[PDB]
Structure 1
């Protein structure tokens, strides 16, 4: 399923897991958001790649 946890990823907005779509900053080396933090506009100024859980 595409709506599952991404293993070994911690959201840099809330320090929790990333379930469903992972938002990986394309600029910073190691920055990721979960869908809630992404929806709140955290880190909005950088382009990210958004992809489902493998």
Structure 2
């Protein structure tokens, strides 16, 4: 069981706007190799901006994201 379902992502923060926990849809990077990973909230996902990551992930526009 997981409380809140996909409406909340406990422990996940948005690397663009910094919101934590992400509320609503979460998009996680499939290609970032850093253990901390890389994530965006839906709003930041819809508006592509320059964000390599708040924790030195060096995410690029060529990486693939997926709804989590």
TM-score by length of 2: 0.61
Q: How many correspondences in the alignment?
A: 51
SS in 1 for 2:10: coil
> In the alignment, which residue of structure 2 is the partner of 1:48?
65
2:40 pairs with 1:23: no
Could you say what the CA RMSD is over the residues aligned between the two structures, in angstroms?
2.0
Tell me which of the two structures has the higher relative contact order, counting C-alpha pairs closer than 8 angstroms and 6 or more residues apart: 1
Instruction: Give structure 1 stretches of 5+ with no counterpart.
Output: none
TM-score by length of 1: 0.73
